[PDB]
Ligand binder design. Structure first.
Ligand code: CDL
Ligand code: CDL
Ligand code: PLX
Ligand code: PLX
Ligand code: PLX
Ligand code: PEE
Ligand code: PEE
Ligand code: PEE
Ligand code: PEE
Lengths: 121, 175, 56, 329, 54, 53, 104, 64, 459
């Protein structure tokens, strides 16, 4: 799946307009919480490197790190969900438009299938 | 006792002989068992009665769980996971029930062997044949499945056995 | 003395808060697997006069 | 209700009370050995009652009281057999232990750890009662290993002596050599008969094959100090005289002979294993008596006498006379 | 203890790997820094690629 | 914790299985049915493949 | 407190290193004898006689009376096999071959 | 210290691949494995044949 | 399942925000509380499993291992409290952090509905152990031991990742439930043979197998007491759990495939039990005993019968507890003697009687004395092997005998005889050490009352 050549794709569009039809990630999304945790860890390591009280040196700096991480994570998650939605839409459309390549398998019950039995001895 | 069903675990009438003192000497067994009764059985009995009236003052019941019958693995599609799950659970429950059945039969056999004592070889032939039959049945269903056993493996084993039986019957008829 | 032992004993409260939060998260994750509630072949049951869901 | 069961379990239960009180204050006083001796004497005089009931009636019973784990079809439970052998051996063992502790109160008068010695003796007695009254093979193995461990502890009573530790390790080695055959018998019985219970095994084995009986014979040879594995019994004289008088002379060392007696319905249906048992007993009694007639240590002489008597016991077993071997015990 | 566990089992997996990796590292990294040899090797690999992959 | 583990409810369904087996054997003995069947599944609903060899 | 030179090394080939190794293990040069120089990693450890500890003098005042060893003396390679709790090499009144043949 | 170090840590650096070492190592590290493999393989082949012909009498064998 | 995971995560901020002299008290109390919380998982069903969510499930094979993993942490903290006394607060906090991370990784490993998540956590457990071994280690060979431990594991496990991604590409799912219900036979093919080898060798190396067991003596001898405890008690059982989980896909190929491993383990248990007889080190002796027990567990898993699986589970739990106790006893001796050699300090029963009693109980439970769960697993595995083949018993017999020997040997060399005259710094045993031994030993004798609680899903 190389989607660079997809027809009707704006070159440098981070989030296309049709992505607005997808549900946005919730503000309490676990991945957003993880990005905020990453920002908090970045703040702690920043305090540790510059030889400052790790937990309580700069509250504004740690808050800025967490907020920026959450912002970028929200937009990145939006783009991720949009790209996966595009992949699924393309796969379903291709399956619909090529019936001969995806035949409907005849439903068969185990009572009429013969599976070889290997005893455990 | 009413706590357990007499038909499931049968017992003989337990005929016992009568005391026939051929001598006038007072045997120690009777006096010993009477003093044992007086010193042990009565206090235990009264304690039990007190506990029983304490239990009757508070009464509650619990009900044995009943299960519906679900289509087994033979009425399941090759990849339909929901029915295979239901059939596997049902098969495991039936396996547990069969294990308990074999346990009950083995209990019958052990009880007979102890109860009839010295003539256990003759007076327990019924229980021996019963256990032989149930053991033959149980072994056929689950003996070689091994670990990671499943309903599909049991069904495949049954199919292999029944094709073998059908071929043997056809060859015997056409012999 | 209150407001003084707190500054030294505040750490103890964290493990139980984590436990109750984990219980809440377990229930919340459970809430998302209700697609087959009161639909299993083994437990199809008719709802009680004052019952909405068989299990929460 | 039928006081046979209550009495025959009460004896074994009250045999355990001093072990419970071993953490109490009485264990730190000089009255502990007398406490243990009185407990043993009361246990003996209380177990005399089921013996009288058996003599009057011939009353037999099995008590499967506690249900342990059940694996698939197989069920494991705390089951006690109170057959003629159990109800006959218990009073004799309790009387011998009572006499042994009365003697040991005087023989161990200057031993600083006399309460621990008495505790060790009571633990061995309890374990041997477990071994004798066992109805299934797992409980019998529990007693089998417990008596061996207590013998290991009692032989090396003076742990500053190198030779006592060497003798204890010798006893453990030979008992494990017998344990190999014991475990073989257990595995064969579970696999073929589908149970470790005595009643089931007798019922499903009308013509017992060679292998389980060979395993049982190996275990009996290991624990009764037959010719193949004899030297540990003479080497066990390193322990205190009460230990040699109680364990290695009259109660513990008859464990193999008692085990072969327990499986006499299967012993009588096989002819080769009977011949092996007879030959082993004969060679053991000859060799041990031959060694005895020329020793200078009195304890060694009497221990070799005990080993020769055990050989005679297995000679009795090999000619299909288990009850007479029990009477000899 | 000594023949198998301390010597041969040690000789087979860990020691052989250590010796082989040491020899390979010594052979590969031992270059005197002469771009003459480097570019002669470049010519050789260029001609080999022209002769082998088409 | 030991007390809690000791009094755990029967989620393994051991007494349930015992009662089920008791009721089942009570019924089978009366009917004259031969205890437990050899086949775990009924043969009428199994469709074997015909050999014709 | 032990230095690098106080540990066993490779097999001695020259008389000078043989004497140095004998000095290391606190014995005479004439009494020092390493194991034969094969593949097994004996290295440079003395080959003391294969006599057990049981037949050592039980009346000498050893620093370890139970093990019958002195503090600084060299230790046999197979000491833990000869600890008076295990196989011993004490001579018997009857010769080994006679007991074997007689027993056999 | 010298005893323990020579017993444990001085073995391999003084090892030399020798016909004695090679043959003893190969024997004591390979021969038992192949011997037991042959024994168990023969036993299991015999058991499998006996169960194929069915003359094994596996009555009451329910636990494995 | 988060009701256990979240408190374990909260253990870290609590430790790092603790007062400089209250870390041990806070850590032990909350670890014991988390262990109590873990006890709820033990109430399993005879049905499928305790499927909490799409990510984590519980099983009666997973539940005893989870309970043991939770219970081990307070013991490790109590054992480590002694030798970390002269250490700065930051480094003690780092040590506690590493222990907490190890517990968290193990807890997530044992639930792990998906095989790739299981592999990720299974290899994540490697870093804290390596750092603990190579940082707070006494000798100079801790670096070599860490290198061995890392590279044996990674050489074993790198093919496993390729096999897993290939299996997901073909089948379509790596989920345990889907794999079990959709399992299909593997044809006897060269590609299938190599797939079997890649799936099995990663768990074989960590047991470890007799051929691949070299890293273990180094890692056990050179690691601190907490490292030795976690290696012997939990980290060795990861291979057994992985084999029991992954073997379902392998059949029917396992029967032919199993012979090289069955022979290696049946001979290696004898080899390692015999090695134990001639050892000059306590830690090495305990390590080799662990190798023998895990070789027996390998045999049980490879036989692949119900009794085999129950015996393997029981033996894993019993060995974990027993080996942790043995390492704790050896460390108590070492902290007084500083030599860690058996023949130096002797006759310790005269000086430390209660500690000698603890030694006796530990050696008896290592000896598999009935009715301990050690012998329960021993006997179940032996019976299953006998049903597999009537000749195996002979080897098993030897093993049992040899085991007893060295066990009592370790009991006789250090506790019985005459105390060394020169050593005079043998102080009376502390309450902390006696509590450690009691907390190690009481669960075994409690579990022997309820064996079914540790007999696995095939009970
Ligand atoms: C699985 C996911 C879940 C867990 C996540 C895991 C990761 C999380 C954290 C990630 C990183 C963020 C923090 C690291 C910054 C480093 C700062 C530091 O060192 O600590 C000092 C600092 C205390 O010291 P200080 O007084 O400030 O000054 C001393 C100097 O800082 C320094 O003093 P010094 O320099 O004199 O001391 C020297 C020492 C100091 O050197 C260090 O300590 C370096 C720090 C570690 C390196 C970090 C690398 C990046 C993160 C990687 C994490 C790896 C995880 C993956 C698994 C592999 C494991 C390696 O270095 C050495 O001793 C040299 C040798 C060290 C041994 C080998 C090194 C191994 C280190 C690997 C550690 C991995 C886990 C780290 C966990 C956190 C540790 C602080 O620690 C703290 O107080 C901060 C800890 C966290 C704060 C918690 C606050 C939250 C509580 C309130 C909120 C409640 C939460 C819940 C809400 C709702 C409840 C109501
Ligand atoms: C037997 C019935 C008992 C009923 C009463 C309840 C007894 C409960 C005891 C629990 C175990 C003790 C705790 C473990 C560590 C020790 C604790 C401690 O610090 O003691 C200091 C305390 C005071 O010491 P001290 O004077 O200050 O210090 C002196 C020196 O340290 C010098 O110390 P020492 O040389 O005096 O050493 C203490 C003494 C004892 O200390 C120990 O060695 C404790 C460990 C012994 C067993 C070793 C593991 C073997 C596997 C057995 C698994 C059984 C589990 C059953 C459930 C247990 C539940 C917790 O040494 C021995 O006696 C060795 C005994 C070897 C027994 C061999 C046979 C074992 C199997 C017997 C059958 C068991 C099931 C029967 C089922 C069928 C019939 C119902 O001494 C004691 O408390 C001794 C306790 C009495 C000995 C009990 C031996 C049998 C226990 C078997 C387990 C419970 C069975 C329950 C059902 C019985 C029917
Ligand atoms: C290592 C961790 C990753 C961090 C990377 C740095 C983070 C800081 C970057 C700050 C914002 C960068 C976004 C740029 C703004 C607009 C971008 C937009 O115009 O470009 C689009 C493309 O958007 C960007 O490519 C998305 C970049 C986002 C990278 C995040 C993925 C990280 C991998 C997963 C690890 C998780 C990291 C989470 C913590 C940051 C259109 O691309 P297109 O002209 O059509 O085709 C060229 C690309 N092709 C050829 C591959 C198809
Ligand atoms: C010091 C000298 C002695 C003094 C004391 C004298 C008194 C001795 C008595 C002590 C033991 C003697 C034997 C008496 C046994 C009676 C109690 C027994 O019957 O209860 C057991 C109960 O014990 C428990 O089942 C086992 C204990 C649980 C073990 C869990 C470990 C604790 C957690 C700690 C962390 C775990 C670390 C290891 C990880 C796996 C078995 O119960 P069960 O027959 O079934 O059914 C109970 C009734 N039901 C039917 C209503 C349910
Ligand atoms: C070092 C410490 C231990 C490490 C782990 C050791 C365990 C791994 C060893 C792997 C076991 C055997 C691998 C393959 C076994 C296949 C069966 C074979 O041995 O039997 C015959 C196979 O014949 C020959 O063995 C052919 C292979 C010969 C080449 C293999 C090298 C032999 C020795 C190498 C051992 C080195 C292993 C370690 C490498 C680093 C059967 O003949 P055939 O019917 O035709 O083949 C059946 C298989 N089919 C159906 C897929 C075709
Ligand atoms: C000591 C461990 C045991 C080692 C035994 C053999 C050692 C010698 C092998 C050395 C490495 C060989 C590398 C190449 C092997 C090629 C195997 C292979 O390609 O099979 C892949 C097979 C089928 O290939 P396809 O082409 O996709 O099928 C289509 C047609 N049927 O698919 C798979 O199963 C992929 C799984 C990866 C295979 C694992 C390769 C590595 C060897 C297996 C592990 C054994 C060594 C473990 C090291 C032990 C150290 C602790
Ligand atoms: C003591 C102080 C209290 C005294 C007054 C009360 C006297 C007893 C009255 C209690 C009521 C009876 C009772 O305990 O209930 C049964 C209850 C068990 O419950 P069950 O359902 O029958 O089986 C377990 C599965 N459910 O009985 C008991 O457990 C108590 C007594 C059991 C025997 C004592 C234990 C002795 C052995 C200890 C274990 C030894 C190792 C295991 C044995 C190996 C055998 C292969
Ligand atoms: C294709 C290529 C495959 C390569 C596989 C590499 C396996 C990882 C081991 C890499 C080690 C190679 C480097 C090396 O050993 O150097 C020698 C080095 C010298 O030490 P230095 O600190 O570097 O300095 C010494 C002088 N002052 O020797 C050592 O120390 C080695 C100590 C640890 C040994 C590790 C053993 C790892 C191998 C175990 C078996 C698995 C190997 C991987 C493949 C197995 C095949 C299935
Ligand atoms: C097969 C079994 C193989 C034997 C295993 C050998 C294990 C070697 C390690 C043991 C440790 C060394 C040791 O225990 O020391 C020997 C120690 C000390 O010697 P003492 O005589 O006590 O001298 C004290 C006076 N100074 O004595 C011993 O315990 C040695 C015991 C070795 C016995 C091995 C021979 C057994 C042969 C039995 C064959 C007959 C089997 C019976 C058949 C019955 C069939 C129905």
């Amino acid at each position: 799946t190389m989607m660079s050549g997809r027809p009707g794709r704006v070159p440098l569009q981070f989030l296309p307009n049709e992505a607005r039809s997808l549900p946005p990630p919730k503000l309490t999304d676990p991945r957003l919480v993880y990005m905020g945790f990453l920002g908090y860890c970045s703040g702690l390591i920043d305090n540790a490197i510059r030889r400052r009280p790790v937990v309580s040196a700069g509250l504004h700096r740690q808050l800025l790190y967490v907020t920026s991480f959450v912002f970028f994570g929200y937009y990145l998650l939006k783009r991720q969900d949009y790209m996966y939605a595009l992949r699924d839409h393309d796969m379903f459309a291709y399956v619909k438009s090529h019936p001969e390549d995806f035949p409907e398998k005849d439903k068969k019950t185990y009572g009429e299938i013969l599976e070889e039995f290997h005893p455990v001895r | 006792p009413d706590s357990w069903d007499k038909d499931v675990y049968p017992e003989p009438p337990r005929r016992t002989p009568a005391p026939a003192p051929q001598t006038s000497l007072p045997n120690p067994v009777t006096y010993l068992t009477k003093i044992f009764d007086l010193l042990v059985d009565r206090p235990v009995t009264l304690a039990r009665e007190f506990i029983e009236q304490q239990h009757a003052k508070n009464r509650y019941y619990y009900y044995h769980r009943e299960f519906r019958r679900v289509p087994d693995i033979t009425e399941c599609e090759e990849k339909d996971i929901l029915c295979m799950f239901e059939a596997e659970m049902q098969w495991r429950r039936d396996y547990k029930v069969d294990q308990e059945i074999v346990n009950i039969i083995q209990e019958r056999l052990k009880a007979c062997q102890q109860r009839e004592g010295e003539s256990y070889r003759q007076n327990c032939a019924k229980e021996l044949e019963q256990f032989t039959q149930v053991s033959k049945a149980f072994q056929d269903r689950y003996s070689d499945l091994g670990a990671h056993y499943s309903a599909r493996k049991c069904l495949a084993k049954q199919k292999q056995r029944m094709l073998a039986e059908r071929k043997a019957a056809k060859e015997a008829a056409a012999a | 003395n209150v407001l003084q032992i707190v500054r030294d004993h505040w750490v103890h409260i964290l493990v139980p808060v984590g436990f109750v939060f984990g219980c809440y998260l377990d229930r919340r994750s459970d809430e998302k697997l209700t697609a087959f509630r009161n639909k299993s072949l083994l437990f199809k049951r008719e709802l009680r006069p004052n019952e909405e869901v068989t299990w929460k | 209700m039928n006081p046979f069961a209550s009495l025959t379990l009460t004896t074994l239960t009250i045999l355990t009370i001093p072990i419970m009180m071993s953490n109490s204050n009485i264990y730190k006083t000089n009255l502990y050995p007398n406490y243990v001796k009185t407990t043993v004497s009361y246990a003996f005089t209380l177990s005399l009652v089921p013996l009288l009931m058996f003599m009057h009636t011939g009353q037999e019973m099995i008590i499967s009281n506690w249900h342990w784990m059940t694996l698939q079809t197989v069920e494991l439970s705390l089951s006690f057999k109170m057959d003629y052998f159990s109800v006959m051996f218990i009073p004799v063992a309790l009387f011998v232990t009572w006499s042994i502790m009365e003697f040991s109160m005087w023989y161990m008068h200057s031993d600083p750890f006399i309460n621990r010695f008495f505790k060790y003796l009571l633990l061995f007695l309890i374990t041997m009662m477990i071994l004798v009254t066992a109805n299934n093979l797992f409980q019998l193995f529990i007693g089998w290993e417990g008596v061996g461990i207590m013998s290991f502890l009692l032989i090396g009573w003076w742990h500053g002596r190198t030779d006592a530790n060497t003798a204890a390790l010798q006893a453990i080695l030979y008992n494990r050599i017998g344990d190999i055959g014991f475990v073989l018998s257990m595995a064969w019985f579970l696999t073929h008969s589908n149970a470790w219970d005595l009643q089931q095994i007798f019922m499903l084995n009308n013509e017992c094959p060679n292998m389980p009986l060979i395993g049982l014979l190996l275990a009996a040879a290991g624990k009764s100090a037959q010719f193949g594995l004899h030297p540990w019994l003479p080497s066990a004289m390193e322990g205190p005289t009460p230990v040699s008088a109680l364990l290695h002379s009259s109660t513990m060392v008859v464990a193999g002979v008692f085990l072969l007696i327990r499986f006499y319905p299967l012993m009588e249906t096989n002819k080769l294993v009977q011949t092996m048992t007879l030959c082993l007993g004969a060679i053991t009694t000859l060799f041990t008596a031959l060694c005895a007639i020329t020793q200078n240590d009195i304890k060694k002489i009497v221990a070799f006498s005990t080993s020769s008597q055990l050989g005679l016991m297995m000679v009795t077993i090999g000619i299909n006379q288990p009850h007479l071997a029990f009477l000899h015990i | 203890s000594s023949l198998l566990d301390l010597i041969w089992l040690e000789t087979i997996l860990p020691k052989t790997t250590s010796f082989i990796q040491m020899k390979m590292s010594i052979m590969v990294s031992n270059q005197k820094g002469l771009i003459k040899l480097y570019f002669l090797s470049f010519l050789i690999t260029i001609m080999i690629s022209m002769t082998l992959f088409n | 914790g030991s007390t809690f583990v000791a009094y755990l409810p029967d989620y393994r369904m051991q007494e349930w299985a015992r009662r089920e087996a008791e009721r089942l054997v009570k019924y089978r003995e009366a009917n004259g049915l031969p205890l437990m069947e050899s086949n775990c599944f009924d043969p009428n609903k199994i469709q074997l493949p015909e050999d014709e060899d | 407190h032990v230095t690098k030179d106080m540990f066993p090394g490779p097999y001695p080939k020259t008389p000078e290193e043989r004497a140095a190794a004998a000095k290391k293990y606190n014995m005479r040069v004439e009494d020092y004898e390493p194991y034969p120089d094969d593949g097994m990693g004996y290295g440079d450890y003395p080959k003391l006689p294969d006599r057990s500890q049981q037949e050592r003098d039980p009346w000498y005042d050893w620093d370890h009376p139970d093990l019958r060893l002195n503090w600084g003396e060299p230790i046999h390679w197979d000491l833990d096999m000869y600890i008076r709790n295990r196989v011993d090499t004490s001579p018997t009144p009857v010769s080994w071959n006679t007991m074997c043949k007689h027993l056999f | 210290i010298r005893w323990t170090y020579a017993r444990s840590a001085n073995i391999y650096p003084n090892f030399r691949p020798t016909p004695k070492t090679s043959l003893l190592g190969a024997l004591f590290g390979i021969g038992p494995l192949f011997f037991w493999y042959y024994v168990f393989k023969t036993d299991r082949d015999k058991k499998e044949k006996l169960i194929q012909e069915g003359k094994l009498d596996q009555t009451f064998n329910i636990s494995y | 399942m988060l009701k256990i995971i979240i408190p374990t995560t909260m253990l870290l901020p609590m430790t790092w925000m603790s007062k400089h002299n209250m870390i041990w008290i806070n850590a032990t109390v909350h670890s014991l509380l988390i262990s109590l919380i873990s006890l709820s998982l033990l109430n399993q069903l005879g049905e499928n499993s305790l499927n909490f969510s799409l990510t984590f499930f519980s099983d009666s094979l997973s539940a005893p291992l989870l309970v043991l993993t939770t219970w081990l942490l307070p013991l490790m903290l109590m054992a480590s409290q002694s030798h970390l006394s002269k250490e700065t607060t930051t480094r003690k906090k780092l040590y506690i952090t590493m222990l907490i991370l190890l517990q968290l990784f193990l807890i997530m490993t044992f639930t792990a509905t998906e095989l790739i998540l299981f592999y990720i956590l299974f290899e994540a457990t490697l870093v804290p152990t390596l750092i603990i071994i190579t940082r707070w280690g006494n000798q100079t060979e801790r670096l070599n031991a860490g290198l061995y431990f890392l590279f044996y594991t990674l050489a074993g496990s790198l093919p496993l990742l390729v096999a897993l991604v290939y299996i997901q590409n073909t089948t379509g799912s790596l989920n345990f439930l889907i794999i079990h219900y959709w399992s299909h036979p593997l044809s006897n093919s060269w590609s299938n043979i190599f797939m079997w080898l890649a799936c099995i060798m990663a768990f074989m190396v960590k047991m470890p197998l007799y051929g691949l067991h070299l890293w273990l003596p180094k890692a056990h001898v050179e690691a601190p007491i907490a490292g030795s405890m976690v290696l012997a008690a939990v980290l060795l059982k990861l291979g057994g759990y992985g084999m029991m989980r992954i073997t379902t896909i392998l059949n029917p190929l396992t029967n032919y495939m199993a012979y090289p491993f069955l022979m290696l383990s049946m001979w290696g248990m004898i080899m390692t039990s015999s090695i134990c007889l001639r050892q000059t080190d306590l830690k090495s002796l305990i390590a080799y005993s662990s190798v023998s027990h895990m070789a027996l567990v390998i045999v049980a898993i490879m036989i692949q019968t119900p009794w085999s699986f129950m015996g393997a589970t029981a033996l894993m739990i019993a060995h974990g507890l027993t080996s942790s106790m043995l390492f704790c006893l050896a460390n108590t001796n070492y902290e007084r003697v500083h030599s860690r050699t058996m023949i130096l300090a002797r006759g310790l029963q005269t000086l430390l009687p209660l500690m000698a009693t603890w030694w006796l109980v530990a050696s008896l439970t290592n000896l598999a004395l009935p009715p301990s769960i050690n012998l329960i697993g021993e006997l179940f595995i032996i019976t299953a092997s006998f049903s597999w083949s009537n000749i195996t018993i002979i080897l098993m017999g030897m093993n049992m005998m040899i085991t007893a020997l060295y066990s009592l040997y370790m009991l006789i060399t250090t506790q019985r005889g005459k105390y060394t005259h020169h050593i005079n710094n043998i102080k009376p045993s502390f309450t902390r050490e006696n509590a450690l031994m009691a907390l190690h030993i009481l669960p075994l004798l409690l579990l022997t009352l309820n064996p079914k609680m540790i007999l696995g899903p095939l009970y």
